Ligand binder design. Structure first.
Ligand SMILES: Nc1ncnc2c1ncn2[C@@H]1O[C@H](COP(=O)(O)OP(=O)(O)NP(=O)(O)O)[C@@H](O)[C@H]1O
Ligand SMILES: Nc1ncnc2c1ncn2[C@@H]1O[C@H](COP(=O)(O)OP(=O)(O)NP(=O)(O)O)[C@@H](O)[C@H]1O
Lengths: 394, 394
């Protein structure tokens, strides 16, 4: 009974899951938090934050490796999937990890300093701990590599693109890829002739236009900071305004970069929390700035959803996914009502159902565009890619 | 036979026009260029760049005043219209200029340093030269003051808005206001129940959603730098990317601010020119980067046009205006074909007609949304406001 070990090595943690190759079901999940800190712990399924204070990425993965062995899993690990934050223009699909791939991931790391290096650390440790096991890399950016130049170019001088590689990349590619594949089935669409807009709404959020199975537009840019307003991220922001602020408060780009990434968005406007659940309650209670943060959030999502639709020849569906897209009955309705111009008609009873109802349609029949909720499963998408690559000869 | 003297005092020049109060026709136009420079000239209708080297804004306006007198116009000037770049949140409509208004324009000038002060200089000189004449101020931002908070707020921490006044303002308000008024007639729409998207495309470019006669969304932000990619302006740009570039080339916000405003857009990508006519020819000749600059330009316009439509309950029309919107047969068609998702159907023969055909429809009947070209006339809009205010008792 072979299993796949999926690893998401982040800047300060290591998320992992062990899925059955047969059913792709999760058999075990966990996370090593407080990495590189004098206090690092590992909580599997949440039964006991183990101890590994002052442990590097490989030690953390070693602890994890031992727990898999303590549960006689170590021997069924036939594949290992690595989530890679940024693949530059070098990766257009998932690959079997080799020395060449490592070199290439290293070449593009300057595009995502912190994140990519943590990804390499995780690969280095995984390679050390499971030498005879095939390993693959899944990049959050590859799905968006089908975008045309007109859609990925910035209006900056050409040199910045050709020399420094400044262009739109986009993220949540694995989710967008996974969710759109699922949509073809739920909506009974022909991939080769279809137009979908997927709204991945979580702490990080982005929109993606998938025309005939291909990504043709996405909201994040060279970095995860562009596009929609998010939990702590501002989203699109007039550069003139950022420049004006700097001269006004004497702050630097670093000062401002941190504010835009860690103190803005829902948190920044509400001055309460980045958690939608908290703000939804706050608004229900009469909090004015919570209502404003949510309204602004909803307004920007609708604006990008409509804008991205311009890259489609025909709009067949709008899919909501992610922690927010899958669970927020209110946000979904507000966004949808803010898109009445597109001819959307919501079925409230359907939209009211909790996420336990899985892949479901929430628009009424009279609706010109089908609306649905499709829970994302990036671990499964990664495992599926790994499984596919498991049949290759390298 | 009273006339209105319209003045656009810029950072380096003074554009002016004298319109007949009866027909609002232009009787005389001109421009004093090279202001504050050791070489300043004044070209009326283009018959003789006069001389006024080393002359301030008031001297330049004095030269202009003399030419009006030399043509016995000075005595028919019953009103003077001033174009104001930025009105902050203080101005929601055009006003009769008084000491209070001057004070208020001065209060918001920090929102547009260079520009607004030049505007005040022009008002100061006009007041000195025509004491007994009523004068009014028309702000490029007032039409957008109807935007809801959700549409004008940035995802930055609340303090920046409440304390520093950082929010979206938008520009081209006079054009958008004038053009949308004209659209109600051309399209036989009921202002009170309508949805229009106006695309002001010139060297500076912006989109605006007018719902039931009111502006509810616009593309420029706190400054003219946000939104569409323009002649020399980049348009929306991922702040993360700007931050990354800075650390990479060691440039400052000022360095980058200048590049985004003066070396980007059509000029930046084509590395040829900011003039569409030049690039259109370049592409026709096989220039690859010209074709890319134009395609990118077209792609971003379509994206914002569709996104802005989300702020409408129903899309009745899409209006093209400005130097580019009024004259570019190619760009109009490309944008429109890039919006097939909205059900637009173009009438090529109609779209082929030159601007001499004035306000005209360019979409075919089968089209779900009417498309048209409406030449903008900001001088006329200003004169009309002045005329209205001319009947008031102050
Ligand atoms: N029942 C719920 N109702 C409303 N919002 C919810 C609910 N459950 C989670 N959320 C919200 O959605 C967010 C978390 O989304 P999620 O996709 O799980 O996280 P994330 O993996 O850290 N995002 P990203 O890191 O870019 O992949 C929080 O803001 C939550 O408040
Ligand atoms: N016949 C034409 N065909 C294509 N493009 C044209 C034509 N005439 C003017 N343009 C373009 O449109 C631009 C000038 O637009 P216009 O609205 O007149 O200028 P502007 O007043 O300086 N813009 P703004 O300063 O923000 O109001 C140039 O890029 C021109 O190449």
């Amino acid at each position: 009974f072979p299993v796949v070990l999926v690893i998401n090595c982040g800047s300060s943690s290591i998320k992992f899951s062990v899925l059955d190759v047969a059913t792709c079901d999760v058999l075990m999940a966990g996370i090593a938090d407080g990495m590189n800190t004098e206090n690092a712990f590992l909580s599997i399924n949440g039964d006991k934050p183990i101890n590994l204070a002052h442990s590097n990425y490989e030690d953390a993965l070693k602890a994890i490796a031992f727990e898999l062995e303590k549960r006689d899993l170590t021997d069924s690990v036939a594949l290992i999937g690595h989530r890679i934050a940024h693949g530059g223009e070098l990766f257009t699909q998932s690959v079997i990890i080799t020395d060449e791939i490592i070199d290439n991931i290293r070449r593009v790391s300057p595009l995502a300093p912190l994140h990519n290096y943590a990804n390499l650390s995780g690969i280095d440790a995984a390679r050390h701990l499971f030498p005879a096991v095939r390993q693959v890399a899944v990049f959050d950016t590859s799905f968006h590599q089908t975008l045309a130049p007109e859609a990925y170019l910035y209006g900056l001088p050409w040199e910045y693109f050709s020399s420094l590689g400044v262009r739109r990349y986009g993220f949540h590619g694995t989710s967008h890829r996974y969710v759109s594949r699922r949509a073809y089935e739920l909506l009974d669409l022909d991939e080769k002739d279809s137009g979908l807009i997927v709204a991945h709404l979580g702490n990080g959020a982005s929109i993606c236009a998938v025309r005939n199975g291909q990504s043709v537009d996405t909201s994040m840019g060279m970095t995860p900071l562009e596009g929609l307003m998010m939990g702590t991220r501002s989203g699109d922001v007039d550069f003139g305004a950022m420049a004006w602020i700097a001269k006004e408060t004497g702050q630097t780009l670093s000062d401002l970069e941190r504010v835009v990434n860690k103190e803005s968005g829902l948190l920044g406007i509400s001055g309460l929390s980045s958690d939608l659940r908290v703000l939804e309650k706050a608004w229900h209670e009469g909090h004015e700035r919570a209502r404003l943060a949510i309204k602004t959030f909803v307004h920007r999502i609708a604006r990008h959803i409509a804008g991205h639709a311009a890259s489609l020849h025909r709009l067949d569906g709008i899919i909501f996914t992610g922690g927010i897209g899958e669970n927020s009955v209110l946000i979904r309705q507000l966004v949808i009502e803010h898109l009445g111009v597109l001819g959307l008609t919501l079925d409230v009873e359907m939209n009211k159902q909790p996420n336990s109802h899985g892949e479901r349609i929430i628009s009424a029949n009279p609706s010109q565009v089908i609306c649905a909720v499709i829970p994302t499963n990036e671990e499964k998408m990664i495992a599926l890619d790994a499984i596919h690559l498991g049949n290759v000869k390298a």
